[PDB]
């Protein structure tokens, strides 16, 4: 689909069998979701943006269906202000910026 | 143009006739530029990123050419590690997300 930016580019995702809403974020290198439980082992990591750094749980090779498109990759879980789908997964679904 | 997301979508922007590299960021509601001594009045504002809020100076109706496309709007200046072009300006240059 083609998405304009007059409003936040929010989309529904399926992860761990549960539906969630997330923001398609070209400015984020990684995908970061609010605290939640996910199958498998995770590794402690830290990521930063504006405002500073936060501690997250790194889960690898996690399947996520984004607006009907399949992706399987790294998902960071932590106290992020909101769910963000970063470039690591945006590239998997063939998402590009156009103007 | 079409910009893929294999690497950070950094483009050249012109503000004050000067050139800077900035990130096309669909996840940002606002445009936040690294500290720069812009002239004129401004209003204090707090913007929140992944690691918390930072204080910025809000400048209104500032001309900004993004990768050759002209825009004009609100630009926030503060201690961000990277220049970010948010939806407030991305919409002006007709930028969309596609997949
Ligand atoms: C700058 C800005 C605004 O002016 C208004 C609203 C949000 C933001 C904002 O920082 N949005 C961010 C998403 S994280 C997010 C946080 C809160 C609400 C929605 C999204 C940016 O799109 C992405 N953001 C762009 C950029 C911000 C300056 C530092 C270098 C990158 C860091 C990157 C980022 O945070 N990456 C993570 C991997 C940690 C997620």
Swiss-Prot record, chains A, B:
Residues 20-89 form the Peptidase A2 domain. Residues 1-5, 49-55, 88-99 are annotated as: Dimerization of protease. It comes from the Viruses. The active site is at 25 (for protease activity). Aspartyl protease that mediates proteolytic cleavages of Gag and Gag-Pol polyproteins during or shortly after the release of the virion from the plasma membrane. Cleavages take place as an ordered, step-wise cascade to yield mature proteins. This process is called maturation. Displays maximal activity during the budding process just prior to particle release from the cell. Also cleaves Nef and Vif, probably concomitantly with viral structural proteins on maturation of virus particles. Hydrolyzes host EIF4GI and PABP1 in order to shut off the capped cellular mRNA translation. Homodimer, whose active site consists of two apposed aspartic acid residues. This is Protease. It comes from Human immunodeficiency virus type 1 group M subtype B (isolate ARV2/SF2) (HIV-1).
